Amino acid sequence: IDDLKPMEEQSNPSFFKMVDYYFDKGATVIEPKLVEEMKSNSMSVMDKKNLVSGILKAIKPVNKVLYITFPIRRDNGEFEVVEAWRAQHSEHRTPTKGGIRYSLDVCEDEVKALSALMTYKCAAVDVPFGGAKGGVKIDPKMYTDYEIEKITRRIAIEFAKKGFLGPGVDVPAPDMGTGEREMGWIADTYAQTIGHLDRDASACITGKPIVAGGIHGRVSATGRGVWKGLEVFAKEPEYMEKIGLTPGLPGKTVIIQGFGNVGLHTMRYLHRAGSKVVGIQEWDCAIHNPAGIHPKELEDWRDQTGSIKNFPGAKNFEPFGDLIYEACDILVPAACEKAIHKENAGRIQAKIIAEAANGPTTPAADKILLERGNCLIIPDMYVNSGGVTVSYFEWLKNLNHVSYGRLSFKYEEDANLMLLQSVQDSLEKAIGKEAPVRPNAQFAAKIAGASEKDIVHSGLEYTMARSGEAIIRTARKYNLGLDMRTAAYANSIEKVYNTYRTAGFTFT
Amino acid sequence: QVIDDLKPMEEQSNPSFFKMVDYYFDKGATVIEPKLVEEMKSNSMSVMDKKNLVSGILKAIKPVNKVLYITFPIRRDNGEFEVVEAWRAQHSEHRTPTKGGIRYSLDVCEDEVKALSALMTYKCAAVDVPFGGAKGGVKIDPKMYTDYEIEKITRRIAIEFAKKGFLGPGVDVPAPDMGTGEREMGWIADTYAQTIGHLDRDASACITGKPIVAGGIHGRVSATGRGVWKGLEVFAKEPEYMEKIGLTPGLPGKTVIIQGFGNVGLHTMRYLHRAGSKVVGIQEWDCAIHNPAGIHPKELEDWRDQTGSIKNFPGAKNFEPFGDLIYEACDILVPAACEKAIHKENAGRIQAKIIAEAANGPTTPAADKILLERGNCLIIPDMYVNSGGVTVSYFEWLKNLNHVSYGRLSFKYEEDANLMLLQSVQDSLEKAIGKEAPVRPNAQFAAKIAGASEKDIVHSGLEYTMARSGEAIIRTARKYNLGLDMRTAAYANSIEKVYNTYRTAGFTFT
């Protein structure tokens, strides 16, 4: 039907195929440099082109999909068969990394598309994992705690038996329908059965509860990275003027589509950065307030009343699905894929679109806005990878068998106080009077609060900034304009390809 | 088109293979369930409780447990690269390793490997082979690749399958199938032994169908054919069914039409021609030949070997409407080609009194029903009668675990014991009758003694299993008054064995 039109003309394209289209755009930018960098005096130019083309060809398709079925007895005593999948898109680095969904939506093509995006996300943030994705095809709200635990423990055993769960092979994480209690159950099941000799059993999964080896700073990480991603680009006048904006995040109006975890923490960090979140669009409501909604009050009001609607500090915006077409400086899509498509891209008045969700903009809509010349799209596989980065830190913490800062916080504090007293001694000698030299209020507060989350945050921010700058240099180098998505894919593909070339692949 | 896939299974023209097997499974499940409940010893469960547990176990057995799908690049011989897809299904892990062949074919799909992996579970159970069923495929046409490229593909699937637990002597043991043979089998064993399994004492037990030098077993090549013969033998000796279908007992003199002259059809025709049957027809994919006086298997194979086909075989006539030879009158029809060869639209034209399903799923449920109601056709079901190879593959796996070939430490010992016994009889006979009285192996025994070898142990084991399984099918069909529905008797026997594994391993809670 539609799926014969070109990809930049499709209305309801496949998710995996639109990711492959973004891959191809990126491979095209980078392949000349790759052929040029290959050096053999025993390879002809055709040899070199074929090898580069062959590695890029290998990267695109999912390496591996495990499909399983198993029985369970429901709490009522009857028996039912459950399906589950785990895709490992790329093993150029192991373990693979990616979440597990409990949803009726899960399908093989879905885990394939998102596992591929996971490969490019990890590469974007210099996280040494190939991408993976899993799903159990259940509506979890239809099951008791005990039924969910039985299902969770059974996928842990079956996945682990076949090499689809393990600290060195495949490390999952929460997704839609799962959370930290399921990760704690998977970790325990692994540690207690087929990983009972694994010294690093708790590194088999991330998003664990703190008491089971989880990491502080996980819950807000994705939202905090979206903020840092927006920050990296908002400081650039070249792109800010071409889209008609002034630099910096303070003052910018933000419409956020989705008040789940990522939208909420983005709102939190954006609000906490001086922005006005003038609109919240949800699946059945939308509140707007040109003054901006306060995320605490609205989270509380949503907590209290169950919904953002009628939010005392916010009018209900009706035609509530059209709040995203309202005028804003930044639109933050944080709900499902293909939210900006062929048929609505032109109605988007946002000057920046920060893709907090996976695949919110179809190739068709990406084109319309790029040709329009006044829209900066910050791509999903960069801007929404803050959680990926922190998950790497959680895996490391489990391999380390100690929390970050345990052996350094006091040592460093005492060293800093000794340094400050040395300066005070030196100053009082030079000026001949009492002159205290103490931490100011900010430094005193960070010293008093020093905790693992600070180390996580600093590490996240360091990575988001470096990755963002590399995407900018690439766009500039190839005169890609506001097409930061093609720049980001070129950078990620290049890293994957160079893994293959130094490993020396071919041997199949 | 698919209006068919809506009719009851027994009305369908082109049912799915996996749907056929599940319908056949349900027929066996239905017969056997009351006994299964009985077999559940538990003072803590009511009979209601036990009926529920049994139905949960049967619900678990039917669907394929696991499927691994992989893609990987290969460098063609000229230097450009191509991505290749492969699958491995493990239908049941109630016993491990799983067992099943690997196809190199363009026809391999996830659903065919699934349908045939389930069949494998029931085949292995039919012949008391302690493996769950498995099936694999690489989606290539192998004749479009050089030997070098086939070896690279073969070694890569060995590595990727073994890393994920889809190749190994205790987890999953493959075998040849369409598009593969013993050289690929030897390449997989060597790759396994040299990489993922380099600390495996029993690395060569990772796969069967191996060349002899790599640990293959004598008697593998004709084993499926020899089992088809012995399965037909067990039933031809029963007058209750030979009469009902209008036949005399015994294979000697019976007329045979074989559909397909691949490995299975050729070795069936050799064993049936020996033993005294008359193979009057051979139907292949483009020809048929016929000779109402019987076709000699060795002359035919030679002629095909020299010319490339059975066409114009001097010892027969070409039969035209060549795709219609299987409707000609014969005592035994041996379908030995593709699945669903007998279906709703042609079943009535079968004149064979006995159909021996050498192929997998040659008779659709629609046709199976059409021929059962006629009352004059005995179908010997695939998952029993074509399981001679599975049996011998179990023996090949055991030989690799044993690290010695069968008879190496017994042939001479038993020969010398047998000579001493015969010499003892001779001494006793000469003393009692007072004259010279030689007591020696007769010509048959002396021939068996001189040629004693691993193939003989394999053959005797194969025959022993085929006979016991065939007799257990007949006993089950008698007990449940199934008549000539031997298929439903076979699935009932297969299901019961799988179920009893679950019952003793325990499924009460999980």
XYZ file of N, CA and C in Angstrom, chain A residues 370-486:
351
model
N 13.304 19.528 7.419
C 14.639 19.915 6.981
C 14.572 20.865 5.793
N 13.711 20.571 4.811
C 13.581 21.483 3.677
C 13.007 22.815 4.122
N 12.172 22.806 5.165
C 11.606 24.053 5.656
C 12.668 24.972 6.248
N 13.834 24.437 6.612
C 14.982 25.245 6.970
C 14.950 25.884 8.342
N 13.857 25.755 9.096
C 13.720 26.465 10.363
C 13.410 25.522 11.525
N 13.861 24.277 11.443
C 13.599 23.308 12.498
C 14.867 22.517 12.753
N 15.308 22.517 14.006
C 16.437 21.711 14.447
C 15.897 20.500 15.193
N 16.076 19.318 14.614
C 15.690 18.068 15.256
C 16.933 17.462 15.903
N 16.910 17.339 17.227
C 17.966 16.664 17.975
C 17.618 15.179 18.011
N 18.429 14.306 17.421
C 17.957 12.945 17.133
C 17.821 12.078 18.377
N 16.874 11.134 18.302
C 16.599 10.242 19.418
C 17.859 9.514 19.899
N 18.590 8.858 18.988
C 19.687 8.008 19.438
C 20.830 8.778 20.102
N 20.840 10.108 20.062
C 21.757 10.873 20.904
C 21.058 11.388 22.159
N 20.019 12.205 21.973
C 19.476 13.004 23.063
C 18.790 12.152 24.130
N 18.307 10.953 23.806
C 17.591 10.156 24.792
C 18.451 9.039 25.389
N 19.771 9.144 25.256
C 20.702 8.106 25.674
C 21.324 8.368 27.042
N 20.761 9.278 27.833
C 21.282 9.481 29.178
C 21.117 8.260 30.063
N 19.990 7.560 29.930
C 19.778 6.344 30.699
C 20.728 5.230 30.306
N 20.986 5.086 29.000
C 21.969 4.129 28.492
C 23.314 4.333 29.175
N 23.747 5.590 29.264
C 25.023 5.925 29.890
C 25.044 5.494 31.355
N 23.993 5.827 32.103
C 23.967 5.459 33.510
C 23.868 3.943 33.681
N 23.218 3.244 32.745
C 23.161 1.789 32.828
C 24.547 1.182 32.680
N 25.393 1.781 31.837
C 26.790 1.367 31.768
C 27.464 1.529 33.127
N 27.206 2.648 33.805
C 27.784 2.874 35.124
C 27.267 1.848 36.131
N 25.999 1.458 36.028
C 25.492 0.445 36.952
C 26.168 -0.905 36.723
N 26.365 -1.285 35.459
C 27.085 -2.517 35.148
C 28.496 -2.482 35.730
N 29.209 -1.365 35.546
C 30.555 -1.214 36.106
C 30.553 -1.322 37.628
N 29.602 -0.654 38.296
C 29.500 -0.729 39.759
C 29.395 -2.179 40.248
N 28.625 -3.012 39.528
C 28.472 -4.432 39.857
C 29.744 -5.223 39.572
N 30.468 -4.886 38.507
C 31.771 -5.509 38.312
C 32.772 -5.035 39.356
N 32.622 -3.803 39.846
C 33.527 -3.232 40.844
C 33.261 -3.772 42.252
N 32.024 -4.207 42.533
C 31.591 -4.704 43.853
C 31.690 -3.643 44.948
N 31.521 -2.376 44.568
C 31.558 -1.270 45.517
C 30.839 -0.093 44.866
N 30.199 0.737 45.687
C 29.538 1.927 45.165
C 30.564 3.020 44.873
N 30.207 3.914 43.963
C 31.120 4.983 43.585
C 31.256 5.974 44.728
N 32.500 6.347 45.044
C 32.790 7.271 46.123
C 33.052 6.628 47.473
N 32.749 5.335 47.634
C 32.944 4.666 48.920
C 34.360 4.858 49.449
N 35.358 4.746 48.579
C 36.744 4.879 49.011
C 37.351 6.246 48.720
N 36.551 7.226 48.335
C 37.130 8.509 47.972
C 36.477 9.713 48.618
N 35.211 9.640 49.043
C 34.507 10.855 49.447
C 35.198 11.529 50.617
N 35.484 10.771 51.679
C 36.105 11.370 52.859
C 37.543 11.785 52.575
N 38.303 10.912 51.911
C 39.666 11.234 51.505
C 39.723 12.561 50.757
N 38.816 12.740 49.796
C 38.812 13.943 48.974
C 38.369 15.157 49.785
N 37.341 14.992 50.617
C 36.902 16.071 51.495
C 38.029 16.534 52.402
N 38.704 15.593 53.066
C 39.788 15.975 53.963
C 40.909 16.659 53.195
N 41.206 16.192 51.982
C 42.260 16.829 51.196
C 41.889 18.264 50.842
N 40.625 18.494 50.472
C 40.157 19.833 50.119
C 40.173 20.775 51.320
N 39.815 20.281 52.509
C 39.888 21.127 53.696
C 41.330 21.465 54.041
N 42.237 20.524 53.838
C 43.640 20.770 54.101
C 44.192 21.757 53.094
N 43.711 21.680 51.856
C 44.119 22.645 50.844
C 43.609 24.049 51.176
N 42.338 24.162 51.558
C 41.767 25.459 51.909
C 42.437 26.059 53.141
N 42.811 25.228 54.114
C 43.507 25.766 55.275
C 44.919 26.218 54.921
N 45.554 25.574 53.939
C 46.864 26.025 53.481
C 46.763 27.401 52.833
N 45.691 27.641 52.075
C 45.501 28.943 51.449
C 45.197 29.991 52.506
N 44.382 29.642 53.502
C 44.087 30.591 54.571
C 45.345 30.951 55.352
N 46.170 29.957 55.681
C 47.449 30.232 56.331
C 48.308 31.168 55.491
N 48.433 30.873 54.190
C 49.251 31.694 53.297
C 48.694 33.105 53.173
N 47.366 33.234 53.131
C 46.749 34.545 52.956
C 46.912 35.401 54.202
N 46.706 34.811 55.380
C 46.842 35.568 56.616
C 48.276 36.011 56.837
N 49.252 35.223 56.372
C 50.632 35.686 56.451
C 50.885 36.851 55.501
N 50.276 36.828 54.319
C 50.583 37.852 53.333
C 49.937 39.186 53.678
N 48.724 39.173 54.230
C 48.010 40.417 54.513
C 47.982 40.762 55.995
N 48.489 39.892 56.863
C 48.680 40.261 58.251
C 47.409 40.470 59.036
N 46.332 39.810 58.645
C 45.127 39.828 59.447
C 44.415 38.502 59.264
N 43.502 38.235 60.188
C 42.547 37.153 60.044
C 41.810 37.218 58.718
N 41.791 36.090 58.017
C 41.133 36.043 56.720
C 40.667 34.619 56.443
N 39.470 34.246 56.886
C 39.020 32.861 56.703
C 38.864 32.495 55.233
N 39.264 31.267 54.897
C 39.106 30.709 53.555
C 38.366 29.377 53.702
N 37.087 29.366 53.354
C 36.147 28.281 53.586
C 35.396 28.018 52.294
N 34.784 26.835 52.149
C 33.887 26.609 51.008
C 32.763 27.628 51.010
N 32.446 28.154 49.832
C 31.270 28.997 49.734
C 30.026 28.123 49.888
N 28.848 28.741 49.795
C 27.618 28.013 50.095
C 27.394 26.872 49.119
N 27.702 27.088 47.843
C 27.535 26.029 46.856
C 28.495 24.869 47.108
N 29.785 25.167 47.282
C 30.755 24.105 47.516
C 30.450 23.377 48.816
N 30.097 24.125 49.863
C 29.731 23.501 51.130
C 28.565 22.539 50.954
N 27.581 22.917 50.132
C 26.422 22.060 49.904
C 26.797 20.793 49.148
N 27.648 20.903 48.121
C 28.056 19.694 47.407
C 28.914 18.798 48.289
N 29.765 19.390 49.130
C 30.576 18.595 50.045
C 29.689 17.851 51.027
N 28.684 18.538 51.567
C 27.805 17.920 52.548
C 26.955 16.830 51.920
N 26.529 17.028 50.678
C 25.683 16.057 50.025
C 26.382 14.958 49.259
N 27.716 14.956 49.220
C 28.471 14.109 48.304
C 27.978 12.676 48.385
N 27.629 12.121 47.223
C 27.043 10.793 47.155
C 27.203 10.259 45.740
N 26.908 8.969 45.591
C 27.141 8.295 44.320
C 26.428 8.992 43.175
N 25.213 9.498 43.408
C 24.492 10.179 42.337
C 25.269 11.358 41.752
N 26.097 12.040 42.554
C 26.898 13.148 42.023
C 27.907 12.653 40.996
N 28.553 11.523 41.295
C 29.512 10.914 40.381
C 28.816 10.439 39.108
N 27.631 9.845 39.253
C 26.841 9.443 38.092
C 26.488 10.658 37.239
N 25.992 11.726 37.880
C 25.570 12.916 37.139
C 26.727 13.529 36.371
N 27.864 13.696 37.033
C 29.026 14.266 36.370
C 29.433 13.412 35.182
N 29.428 12.088 35.360
C 29.791 11.200 34.271
C 28.811 11.273 33.119
N 27.509 11.352 33.428
C 26.480 11.534 32.403
C 26.696 12.821 31.621
N 26.910 13.926 32.334
C 27.020 15.235 31.700
C 28.261 15.310 30.823
N 29.358 14.726 31.302
C 30.592 14.657 30.530
C 30.371 13.944 29.202
N 29.647 12.829 29.231
C 29.406 12.045 28.025
C 28.457 12.763 27.075
N 27.349 13.303 27.602
C 26.365 13.979 26.757
C 27.004 15.156 26.032
N 27.840 15.925 26.745
C 28.518 17.070 26.140
C 29.485 16.630 25.049
N 30.321 15.627 25.335
C 31.285 15.160 24.338
C 30.593 14.571 23.120
N 29.557 13.765 23.334
C 28.853 13.186 22.201
C 28.172 14.270 21.387
N 27.591 15.258 22.064
C 26.919 16.330 21.353
C 27.875 17.124 20.496
N 29.072 17.381 21.020
C 30.043 18.150 20.260
C 30.531 17.375 19.046
N 30.713 16.057 19.181
C 31.126 15.254 18.032
C 30.065 15.260 16.931
N 28.783 15.228 17.299
C 27.722 15.311 16.297
C 27.764 16.654 15.577
N 28.053 17.726 16.315
C 28.112 19.054 15.711
C 29.283 19.156 14.743
N 30.480 18.734 15.172
C 31.635 18.767 14.270
C 31.370 18.003 12.983
N 30.702 16.854 13.075
C 30.436 16.071 11.873
C 29.466 16.797 10.950
N 28.374 17.336 11.503
C 27.441 18.116 10.697
C 28.159 19.258 9.988
N 28.995 19.991 10.730
C 29.734 21.113 10.159
C 30.671 20.645 9.053
N 31.385 19.547 9.309
C 32.404 19.059 8.390
C 31.813 18.695 7.034
N 30.597 18.161 7.016
C 29.968 17.747 5.774
C 28.890 18.718 5.311
N 28.787 19.880 5.948
C 27.793 20.896 5.612
C 26.393 20.289 5.646
N 26.097 19.584 6.745
C 24.812 18.923 6.894
C 23.731 19.842 7.439
N 24.068 21.073 7.791
C 23.039 22.013 8.203
C 22.422 21.607 9.523
N 21.095 21.569 9.560
C 20.354 21.173 10.747
C 20.057 19.681 10.782
N 20.672 18.893 9.894
C 20.448 17.446 9.868
C 21.436 16.763 10.811
N 21.193 16.988 12.101
C 21.999 16.388 13.150
C 21.785 14.889 13.246
N 20.656 14.388 12.751
C 20.405 12.949 12.764
C 21.368 12.201 11.851
N 21.641 12.741 10.663
C 22.571 12.072 9.759
C 23.986 12.130 10.308
